[PDB]
Amino acid sequence: GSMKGEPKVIERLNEALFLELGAVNQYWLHYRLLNDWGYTRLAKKEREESIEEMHHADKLIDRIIFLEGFPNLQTVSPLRIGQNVKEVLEADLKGEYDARASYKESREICDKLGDYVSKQLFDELLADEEGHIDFLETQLDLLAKIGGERYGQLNAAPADEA
Amino acid sequence: GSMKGEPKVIERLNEALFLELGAVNQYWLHYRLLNDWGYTRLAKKEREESIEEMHHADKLIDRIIFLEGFPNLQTVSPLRIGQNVKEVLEADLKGEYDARASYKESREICDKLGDYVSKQLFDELLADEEGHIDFLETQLDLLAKIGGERYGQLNAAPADEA
Amino acid sequence: GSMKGEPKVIERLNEALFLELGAVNQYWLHYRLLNDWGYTRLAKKEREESIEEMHHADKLIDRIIFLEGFPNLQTVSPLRIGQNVKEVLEADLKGEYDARASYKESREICDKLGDYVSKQLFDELLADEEGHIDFLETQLDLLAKIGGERYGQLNAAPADEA
Amino acid sequence: GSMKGEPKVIERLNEALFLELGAVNQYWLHYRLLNDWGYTRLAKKEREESIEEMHHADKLIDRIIFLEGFPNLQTVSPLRIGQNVKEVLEADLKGEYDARASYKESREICDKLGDYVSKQLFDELLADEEGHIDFLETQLDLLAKIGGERYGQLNAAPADEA
Amino acid sequence: GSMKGEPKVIERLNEALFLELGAVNQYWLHYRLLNDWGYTRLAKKEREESIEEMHHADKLIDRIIFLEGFPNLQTVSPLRIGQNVKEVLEADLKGEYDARASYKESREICDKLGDYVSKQLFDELLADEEGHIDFLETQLDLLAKIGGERYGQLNAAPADEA
Amino acid sequence: GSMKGEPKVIERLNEALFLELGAVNQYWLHYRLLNDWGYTRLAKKEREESIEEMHHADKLIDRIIFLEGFPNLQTVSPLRIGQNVKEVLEADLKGEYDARASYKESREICDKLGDYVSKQLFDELLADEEGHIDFLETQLDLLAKIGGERYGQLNAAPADEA
Amino acid sequence: GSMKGEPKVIERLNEALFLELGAVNQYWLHYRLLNDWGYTRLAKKEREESIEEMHHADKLIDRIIFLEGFPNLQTVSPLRIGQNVKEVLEADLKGEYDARASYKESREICDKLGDYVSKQLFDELLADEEGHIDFLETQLDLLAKIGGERYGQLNAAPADEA
Ligand code: NA
Ligand code: NA
Ligand code: NA
Ligand code: NA
Ligand code: NA
Ligand code: NA
Ligand code: NA
Ligand code: NA
Ligand code: NA
Ligand code: NA
Question: Which ligand neighbours the alpha carbon of D121 most closely?
């Protein structure tokens, strides 16, 4: 018996890790920019989401090592950095769709190759990303309906607690 | 002695139940839509009002069974589903006026037929619906005065607590 | 990228919602009847199960809206209303088998169409319904073995706590 | 201005008091008999119901004195005393129907004569009696369905807590 | 649908408000006079009753606004100000009878015009006023039986707690 | 509707139970041997793992009964009993690989036959066994790197707490 | 007045960030490898040090944004990944010396250009890195003196708490 994973499974896991490290760093930078712009409420959520992506990355790393593969943390996927509140949300949403599409294909490859526990891991990440797509599309819907300046005000703190 | 109710009283009670199940379901769907649109504060109130209508439905069911009638939960009254915040409030208000008018006529029929305890039940529901008409007309007054986009912002949560 | 679901997936979700609203209402009416008949212990469980079905309905509604579909709360599936304790259990069991069969087919359609998160939702509901089929078949087994009158007594409260 | 009530209103109030003192005493004796027969659970409920009828009697006495009438506590309405559990419930039910019919007629006379606060008092007692008719008819339904001996066992305590 | 009340209903509500503001002010002045005269116990009750009348006034104001009428707080009904303890009680009693008679007629007009929730409000105020007529007639009965000077002493505090 | 499972599904469930009872007993005996040899820390973990396998066996038994099959607890799979610390870990690892391979094939058969809830149960056990394979391969890696005598010392308690 | 930093200062800050993201990822992977190898005590320290490097990265990001520069999180410095405990410590030490040398040069450039607050930030990071060089050189000294296998045993947990 051996836990040596399928090379294609470890590749999909590393591709997920590539995207996850990009998302961690994009959310963390969006956090710092949003805070510097005054949108301290959205910034706090952005930092929470960076941390959620760190947990995803950690689960992927752990699974690759268990499959006796080598996790690649040397590179991170292309960042999309926004220059105003709406661009930040739109950039996050595009990265979420990239993750969604990647994990859907990955769960299918793991299933086809008989690695059902890795398949399960991609199924859990897929559900998590769809939840965050929910959130981001809701925020962009709200921003369109009440307008960007009111959306920014709603997500800014007053000066005595900024 | 017999608790067998007047057929016309059980009919009025079932007509109230018909409307009440419609209101439960309309408020619950309005809850889920409002939340998905970002108006998490109005959504929470909408869900509270759905639950209040469930309690009305439950009292009606209990009274019909006590009168040895058969409660009908198979059908629900026509739903009015809004597509923006103002339409949601307007749709709820129309259903409240339907309930108000139905319960006013029902208290009169129960009184005429000598079922004063059923009459009392319609009197309590009538007062409750008028309270909710108060609330909805106040919210629509506020929305007209400060404008729909500011009313939406007021009833939305920031992103770190949405 | 788009969260617009497959029309056939939203149809299966709405078909589940149709059945779920029927189950909510059947369990709630069975609750009120059982209580009126004196079987206050079985009534309390029936009301708990109605609430469990409300949570199922709520998850389905939320998923349909996320897929940008329109949840239908206007109609509810045909109710089976029992006229004694055993008929109540038998009627609930038939509705559970309807839900089981519907969700099994739905998980297969979602899987075939590539909506694995909706598939997951049907998988969780399927497990939940099978648990309730377990319970109902156990209760009907007990009722057959100790007899209906002893089963009724076991599930009735004494008069000072009824 | 004068609080001197209508003679016919005080008569209806005294007629209610007549019935209420009969119900107090019938429930209290049924309590002591049921306990002596071993049905300690039903006995405890019977004693609770005697006390509920004492509160009704007290409200009637207070209202008669406020109307400057003279409450009659010299006589009590005919008691119906059962000789087994089912007869006790049937006897209580007959007295409840007597009270119900009396209070319905009394609320109508008070209303016709313009004493709306006395009318209200009869409306509250009417609702209370209908609740107790609910309870008694439920218990008699249960007794018929599981049988009198099982109903007695259900409402008896074991010997170490009788 | 419209909550625009019947003009005659708003008139009755405003007539009640007229009397209620008079009662508030009469009880508050009677409070201050009684205290200045040394009857600190009766004064405290008088101030409590002023506050109870404020709550009545507030309910009336709220109902008029809900009916889309305009509450009139510009005028207050004629005050009856006593110059000794017995005159204070007699003056309060006369105002209570005025309120009682006004609310009885008002509940009848609201009922006739189909505004059963306003009718209910007058029914609740009517019961409340009859309770206070009870109290005042009891106090005047006591004052006649033990004599005015003993009644005054009973309702005065000693000098170290006056 | 019927919960009568596929005969091949109950066979796979019973095959899992066969292996699980073997693992329970192998871990429990390894516990007692390790303790007797002085390796009280590894012994405590071994006993914890026996109990984890008991929970697996219990879930399988429950599922077989729900499918109206008959759980077989008469036989247990071949035990591999080690005679030193490294052999104990190697023997546990071989049994874990047997369980892993059995559950992977079983999830595939349940899926093919349309029993997705039984499939889910094998998916959860599969993930659990892979976690324990992780642990055992890590311990064997550590034992090779620091040497068996140091690994034994690390997993022994001092004499005043052995 | 303007907070627009010197381009060369932002370059040094971004060069520090480049190294810091490499250190975060190297420590996090070393954490997961060490844990998988059984050295759970050293793994926990490695994860703590990854987090310390995250705080350094965060301070650098914040300072770059304050200087109106653009933080680069797209690339990370070359990782040195060890394949046994001693190589892990040696690889961490080499990265620490790279950071030390980079921050020493950076504090000198910031000082020369008159950005004393950025200079201060490099001075604080420099002190922090020298503390971690202290730790790593101490651990490598200990490993040489007691031997690698005893150093590994010392930094491994027993099986009941691994
Ligand atoms: Na993620
Ligand atoms: Na605003
Ligand atoms: Na209602
Ligand atoms: Na009337
Ligand atoms: Na369900
Ligand atoms: Na599949
Ligand atoms: Na009574
Ligand atoms: Na008043
Ligand atoms: Na197992
Ligand atoms: Na650092």
Answer: 7
CA–CA separation, B139 and B146 (whole Å): 11
The continuous run of DSSP H or E covering A76 comes out as none
**Nearest alpha carbon to residue B159 among A31, A82, A43:** A43
In this structure, which long-range contacts are made by residues D61-68, counting pairs with CB atoms below 8 Å and at least 24 apart in sequence? D61/D17, D63/D13, D63/D118, D63/D121, D64/D5, D64/D10, D64/D13, D64/D14, D64/D17, D66/D3, D66/D5, D66/E130, D66/E134, D67/D3, D67/D4, D67/D5, D67/D9, D67/D10, D67/D13, D67/D118, D68/D2, D68/D3, D68/D4, D68/D5
Is A80 within 8 Å of A98 (Cβ atoms)?
A: no
Residue G63, CA distances (Å) to A25, G23, G66, G122 in order: 16, 19, 5, 11
Tokens representing A64 are 């690759």
One DSSP character per residue, D98-123 reads HHHHHHHHHHHHHHHHT-HHHHHHHH
Contact predicate D3/E130, CB 8 Å: yes
Q: Say if the Cβ atoms of C73 and B36 lie within 8 Å.
A: no
Q: Which residues contact D30 (CB under 8 A, 6 or more apart)?
A: D43, D46, D81, D82, D88, D91, D92
- Give the number of other Cβ atoms within 10 Å of residue G128's Cβ: 18
Amino acid at C136: L
User: Angle CA(B25)–CA(B26)–CA(B27) in degrees, nearest 5?
Assistant: 90
CA separation for the pair A36, A39 (Å, rounded) = 8
Cβ-defined contacts of F83-88 (< 8 Å, 24+): F84/F148, F85/F34, F85/F37, F85/F39, F85/F42, F85/F143, F85/F148, F85/F151, F85/F152, F85/F155, F86/F140, F86/F143, F86/F148, F86/F151, F88/F30, F88/F33, F88/F34, F88/F42, F88/F46
Q: Which residues of A touch B43 (CB under 8 A)?
A: none
Q: Quick one: how far is CA F123 from the chain centroid?
A: 15
Binding site annotation covers B130?
A: no
Q: Which residue of A has its CA nearest to F133?
A: A3
- CB within 8 A of F106, min separation 6: which ones? F12, F13, F15, F16, F122
Are D145 and C36 within 8 A, CB to CB?
A: no
Nearest-CA distance A13 → chain G (Å): 15
Nearest to G22 by CA among G89, G92, G85, G86: G92
List, in sequence order, every residue forming a beta bridge with C118; answer none if it has no partner.
none
Neighbour count for residue D89 (Cβ, 10 Å): 23
Name, in order, each residue with C-beta under 8 angstroms of F144's C-beta and a sequence gap of 6 or more: none
Q: How far is Cα B86 from Cα E68, in angstroms, rounded to an integer? A: 21
- Residues 58 through 117 of chain D touching chain B, CB cutoff 8 Å: 93-94, 96-98, 100-101, 104, 107
Q: Closest-CA residue in chain G for F41?
A: G160
Q: Which ligand is nearest to the CA of E107?
A: 4
Contacts of E133 in chain D (CB under 8 A): 1, 3
- DSSP character at residue A77: P
Helix C40-66 with C7-37: angle, nearest 10 deg: 160
Query: Which residue bears the tokens 């206070």?
Result: E132
Give the number of C-D residue pairs with CB atoms closer than 8 Å.
52
Q: Which residues have a Cβ under 8 Å from the Cβ of E136 and sit 6 or more positions away?
A: E89, E92, E93, E96
Residues in D touching C160 (Cβ below 8 Å): 41-42, 44-45, 48
**Local structure of residue A75 (DSSP, 8 states):** B
Ligand nearest to the CA of B133: 3
Q: Within 10 A of E138 (CB to CB), how many other CB atoms are there?
A: 11
Nearest to A32 among G36, G65, G74 (CB): G65
Instruction: Please state the φ and ψ torsions of residue D3, each to the nearest 5 degrees.
Output: -90, 10
Mutation target among B41, B151, B160, B161 for the A interface, most CBs of A within 10 A: B160
CA-based nearest residue to D13, from D52, D68, D79:
D68
What's the farthest any 2 CA atoms get from each other in chain G? 62
Give the DSSP H or E segment for E6: none
